[PDB]
Ligand binder design. Structure first.
Ligand SMILES: *C(=O)[C@@H](NC(=O)[C@H](O)c1ccccc1)[C@@H]1NC(C(=O)O)=C(CSc2nnnn2C)CS1
Length: 265
């Protein structure tokens, strides 16, 4: 029983775990706390890049964005390095997805524009995909810091999986922009120990991770079986019981993913 296994993992890691895999032709939806809110953390950067792609001609990726010392306020492995030269929108999308770059994401929110530094337009984009649940209220670093239970900067495993399904597998984006998003997620450097670790090597995994305070660790993926059957996998967790400084536990997501992969194989 999957629910028993998921509950066991919660006890093991003193965590709250959320899992959603949307139904397919022959598989029923997999759901565990799937309609409970969890912080986005960096997982928002996948639909964010899609919003930026959608909003602009493809050649907007070649526009150089300049930024300064006071723009670096969060983990920004790429943007810290190019602060002196600037970065193109294309480079920013790359950094945001593949390195979970916080400054890159903040700059992409600014590019999207409008109230709240782009957070309202981001949320508006999710609404256009029929997501009436998720909300983004702050940028990095604030978005990772909301108290457990607080609805600011949250999604649910159910909501984000349906968003990702439309972006990667559905028609939310034209094929050319869809490929850009897909490729970036395919080349992600941060997800080796999460959903990827739970699926056999002959399954293709593309993903976007999130990590935050109160032991928050998320991963949203699209996976393909060895015969090219796709599934969307959203795993979210927090550890409120350790307080603000609770260590995120990647191993929990790898184990949850292993359990999911066992059902889907
Ligand atoms: C997006 O979630 C973003 N998270 C943060 O900036 C958090 O505030 C945070 C910082 C330090 C430690 C924990 C949380 C960034 N995204 C991610 C991610 O997606 O995983 C991380 C995880 S750390 C990482 N990245 N690659 N390899 N490791 C390990 C922190 S920055």
């Amino acid at each position: 029983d999957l629910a028993d296994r998921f509950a066991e993992l919660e006890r093991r890691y003193d965590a709250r775990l959320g899992v959603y895999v949307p139904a397919t032709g022959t598989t029923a939806a997999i759901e565990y706390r799937a309609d409970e809110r969890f912080a986005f953390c960096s997982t928002f950067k996948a639909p964010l890049v899609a919003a930026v792609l959608h909003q602009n001609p493809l050649t907007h990726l070649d526009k150089l964005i300049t930024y300064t010392s006071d723009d670096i306020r969060s983990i920004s492995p790429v943007a810290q390095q190019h602060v002196q030269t600037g970065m193109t929108i294309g480079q920013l999308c790359d950094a945001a997805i593949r390195y979970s770059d916080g400054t890159a994401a903040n700059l992409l929110l600014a590019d999207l524009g409008g109230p709240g530094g782009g957070t309202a337009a981001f949320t508006g984009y999710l609404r256009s995909l029929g997501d009436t649940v998720s909300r983004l209220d702050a940028e990095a670093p604030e978005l990772n810091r909301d108290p457990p239970g607080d609805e600011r900067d949250t999604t649910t495993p159910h909501a984000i999986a349906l968003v990702l399904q439309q972006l990667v597998l559905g028609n939310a984006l034209p094929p050319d922009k869809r490929a850009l998003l897909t490729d970036w997620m395919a080349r992600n450097t941060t997800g080796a120990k999460r959903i990827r670790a739970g699926f056999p090597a002959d399954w293709k995994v593309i993903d976007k991770t999130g990590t935050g305070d109160y032991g928050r660790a998320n991963d949203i993926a699209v996976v393909w079986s060895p015969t090219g059957v796709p599934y969307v996998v959203a795993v979210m967790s927090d550890r409120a019981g350790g307080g603000y400084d609770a260590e995120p536990r990647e191993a929990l997501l790898a184990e949850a993913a292993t359990c999911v992969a066992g059902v889907l194989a």
